[PDB]
Design a binder for this molecule. Structure first.
Ligand SMILES: CCNC(=O)Nc1cc(-c2nc(C(F)(F)F)cs2)c(-c2cncc(-c3n[nH]c(=O)o3)c2)cn1
Length: 193
């Protein structure tokens, strides 16, 4: 296993997301959503909320365990390693192809945040920004796709809606929501089994 930096993704995006058109743009959404879905499949969290923001960014929020908030080697947060090392993997690929990305983790009565810019360069460490009830847990990722890479940066509500509907059907007993702040459109999916 040869590890790589995020430059490898930026120099050959098609290798990681297939293309740099709308299909590729939406692959970024699928990668982050799949991380939330994997967590829910393991039994942590029963709702996943996706928001298309007015500024063109996209947020995915789950109510799972929260990404690990501890340290790797050299005092580097585990979350930084997940988002900045390519193990050629979704999180790092999305970060590499975003002009900015924020990850917010809630667990153990604390809310933590790390911000990356310009293809996944950290501009903060993982810092405690607030507190929450001990019962509150989860991960929220917001990213702005890099307009220098993609030929389109317009997320398509219908495309995402269809995917989340399908994901809700495969998961069972988990609510998937989509909200578009550009148009105010909103929908929720939930399939009981
Ligand atoms: C919005 C995107 N949503 C997202 O990305 N949510 C998300 C991601 C993760 C990842 N964690 C990892 C890695 F590598 F740190 F394990 C990769 S994704 C985990 C997670 C996975 N395994 C173990 C734990 C854990 N907490 N405590 C404990 O004992 O185990 C947590 C949970 N929620």
């Amino acid at each position: 296993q040869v590890l790589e930096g995020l430059d490898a993704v930026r120099k050959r995006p098609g290798m990681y997301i297939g293309s740099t058109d709308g299909a590729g743009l939406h692959h970024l959404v699928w990668e982050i959503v799949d991380n939330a879905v994997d967590e829910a499949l393991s039994g942590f969290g029963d709702r996943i909320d996706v928001t298309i923001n007015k500024d063109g960014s996209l947020t995915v929020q789950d109510h799972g365990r929260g990404m690990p908030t501890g340290m790797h080697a050299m005092g580097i947060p585990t979350v930084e390693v997940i988002f900045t090392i390519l193990h050629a993997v979704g999180s790092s690929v999305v970060n590499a192809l975003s002009s900015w990305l924020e990850v917010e983790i809630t667990r153990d009565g604390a809310v933590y945040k790390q911000r990356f810019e310009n293809g996944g360069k950290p501009v903060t460490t993982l810092k405690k920004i607030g507190t929450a009830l001990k019962s509150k847990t989860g991960t929220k990722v917001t990213f702005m796709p890099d307009a220098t890479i993609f030929s389109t940066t317009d997320f398509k509500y219908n495309t995402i809606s269809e995917r989340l509907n399908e994901s809700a059907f495969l998961l069972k007993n988990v609510t998937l929501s989509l909200t578009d702040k550009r148009t105010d459109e909103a929908i929720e999916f939930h399939y009981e089994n």
